[PDB]
């Protein structure tokens, strides 16, 4: 039997699941960094997009699955009682704070505050904002305010990281070119020589392993 | 209708006969008393039969209409 509205909420949630994952989860970062590094090594389709997306997906679950499981453990709790729509709303909102905290940790306060204003202030006849003292609103930015502010910060972080990975390969390209000129063995295109070198060097140093650890250690302790 | 491969009319004549005896002498109390019984039994027999044949038709029809 159960409740017919909680059934609707379950089925609805399970249809939106892949878009939430694709837009409000560390998958956003992991899937970007790998593809950037792959382009920088200069040989597309090695590794496959299947390999990369598969790994990124698996790693995202270590970070996110405990939070969802904690939320369901919060709701399956036979000792609660309610009296009114308000008392129920509060308890359901309280259930989501575990996720809310994660979004607050990894996103910008001022962009969040901007959208928090923008949901309302088309309504407002006034300029004063102090009118609520911060301690409530700083804790309770809405989730629709948090989501895009989180995604826009994740992308920027991804670019920051990939930038520093490009530099050494650039250096290697300059070295190869300068050597071909110093030898006067001019009429050979350097890319044919330097792409093997980039590949062998990065694999011989296990760049992918160090990269995977360096990404996960922002979000977990492996031990 | 047979289940393929499965291993495994007198009352009508009796009523006809009693009618023919009675018709010859409608005033005999013994022929009247006999005919009353034969006719009553024949009546009950025909009714019970036709009700049962309908009940089986309606079960077969309900089965088909359940999957149809």
């Amino acid at each position: 039997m159960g409740n017919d509205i909680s059934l609707i909420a379950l089925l609805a949630f399970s249809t939106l699941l892949p878009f939430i994952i694709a837009s409000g989860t560390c998958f956003v970062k992991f899937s970007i960094v790998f593809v950037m590094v792959r382009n920088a090594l200069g040989l597309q389709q090695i590794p496959s997009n299947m390999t990369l997306n598969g790994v990124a997906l698996l790693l995202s679950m270590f970070v996110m699955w405990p939070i969802m499981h904690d939320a369901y453990v919060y709701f399956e709790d036979e000792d609660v009682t309610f009296n009114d729509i308000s008392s129920l709303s509060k308890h359901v909102d309280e259930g989501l704070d575990g996720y809310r905290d994660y979004l607050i940790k990894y996103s910008d306060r001022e962009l969040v505050q901007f959208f928090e204003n923008a949901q309302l202030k088309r309504q407002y006849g006034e300029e004063t904002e102090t009118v609520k003292r911060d301690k409530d609103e700083i804790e309770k930015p809405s989730i629709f305010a948090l989501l895009p502010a989180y995604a826009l910060s994740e992308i920027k972080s991804a670019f920051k990281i990939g930038f520093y990975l490009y530099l050494p390969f650039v250096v290697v390209d300059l070295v190869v070119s300068s050597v071909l000129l110093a030898l006067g063995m001019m009429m050979m295109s350097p890319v044919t020589i330097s792409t093997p070198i980039k590949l062998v060097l990065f694999v011989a140093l296990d760049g992918w392993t160090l990269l995977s650890k360096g990404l996960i250690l922002q979000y977990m302790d492996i031990a | 209708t047979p289940w393929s491969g499965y291993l495994d009319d007198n009352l009508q004549t009796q009523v006809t006969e009693a009618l023919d005896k009675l018709a010859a002498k409608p005033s005999d109390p013994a022929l009247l008393a006999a005919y009353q019984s034969k006719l009553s039994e024949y009546n009950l027999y025909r009714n019970a039969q036709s009700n049962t044949v309908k009940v089986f038709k309606d079960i077969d029809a309900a089965i088909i209409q359940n999957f149809r």
Partner: protein, 50 residues
């Protein structure tokens, strides 16, 4: 229940009204799980292609 109490209680209207609830609810539960698994697999395939 395997050879205890009795079989074939097709006929008493008080227990026959208790069986109706169970026979319906278990059919619904099994039907729901069938959809949830398809949704889950479909979400994984959606992300891996894209």
């Amino acid at each position: 229940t395997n050879r205890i109490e009795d079989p074939n209680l097709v006929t008493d209207p008080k227990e026959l009204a208790i069986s109706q609830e169970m026979i319906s609810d278990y059919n619904l539960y099994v039907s729901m799980v069938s959809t949830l698994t398809r949704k889950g697999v479909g979400a994984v395939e959606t992300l891996l292609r894209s």
